[PDB]
């Protein structure tokens, strides 16, 4: 990045480490978790660190486990200003076939609704934990291989571990 390092040093990316040896950084290639991001009006990020925008207003499929069906996420999008080019998120629906084949809903507040029922935070069920983070933002945590982020004003995030 335009700055020097002595040999033998081990700088570390978020993903893994790399070590200077004979002017050549050696590096591992071991996987590391990806993030699909929603924010702004309609600005999306892929797992593979793509950016784009698609100002569609419908119940689109954000993500899904696709060889088996451990989960599935469904954004719901809405126009969000007088302008036609202003489409922000309202809510997202999550579905866990692993537990009851339940249906979680993240609400434009910090609210959540399981199966139509509003629910206090924390929500320790067996796998999934839903608690506030700053007391202004919800965080789901299914098992260890999944996270979420507040879909109140529409800044949805995920954490998918490399098992997926």
């Amino acid at each position: 990045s335009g700055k020097r390092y002595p040999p033998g040093t081990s700088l570390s990316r978020d993903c893994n480490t790399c070590i200077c040896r004979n002017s050549q950084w050696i590096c591992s290639n071991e996987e590391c978790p990806g993030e699909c991001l929603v924010t702004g009006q309609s600005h999306f990020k892929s797992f593979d660190n793509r950016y784009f925008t698609f100002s569609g207003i419908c119940q689109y499929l954000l993500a899904r486990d696709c060889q088996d069906h451990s989960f599935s996420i469904v954004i719901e999008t809405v126009q969000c200003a007088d302008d036609r080019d202003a489409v922000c998120t309202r809510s997202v629906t999550v579905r866990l076939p692993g537990l009851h084949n339940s249906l979680v809903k993240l609400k434009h507040g910090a609210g959540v609704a399981m199966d139509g029922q509003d629910v206090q935070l924390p929500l320790l069920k067996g796998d999934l934990r839903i608690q506030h983070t700053v007391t202004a933002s919800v965080r789901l945590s299914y098992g260890e291989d999944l996270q979420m982020d507040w879909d109140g004003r529409g800044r949805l995030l995920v954490k998918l571990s490399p098992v997926y």
Binding site: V78, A86, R90, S91, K107, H108, G109, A110, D118, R153
Partner: protein, 59 residues
């Protein structure tokens, strides 16, 4: 009934955070969803906003 407890004056309405507030910044709870006091908000087909505690939807 005419109950007994801790209220605050009629100009002020109760907020979630233990304070009570005038109805200007009093959020909306449409579908339960806690909309901030100014939230413009709509599918293709509906059209909705939070004004003052009430959620004004249309179609």
């Amino acid at each position: 009934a005419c109950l007994e407890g801790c209220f605050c004056p009629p100009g002020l309405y109760m907020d979630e955070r233990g304070d009570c507030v005038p109805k200007a910044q009093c959020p909306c709870y449409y579908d339960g969803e806690i909309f901030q006091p100014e939230d413009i908000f709509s599918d293709h087909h509906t059209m909705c906003y939070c004004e003052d505690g009430f959620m004004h939807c249309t179609m």
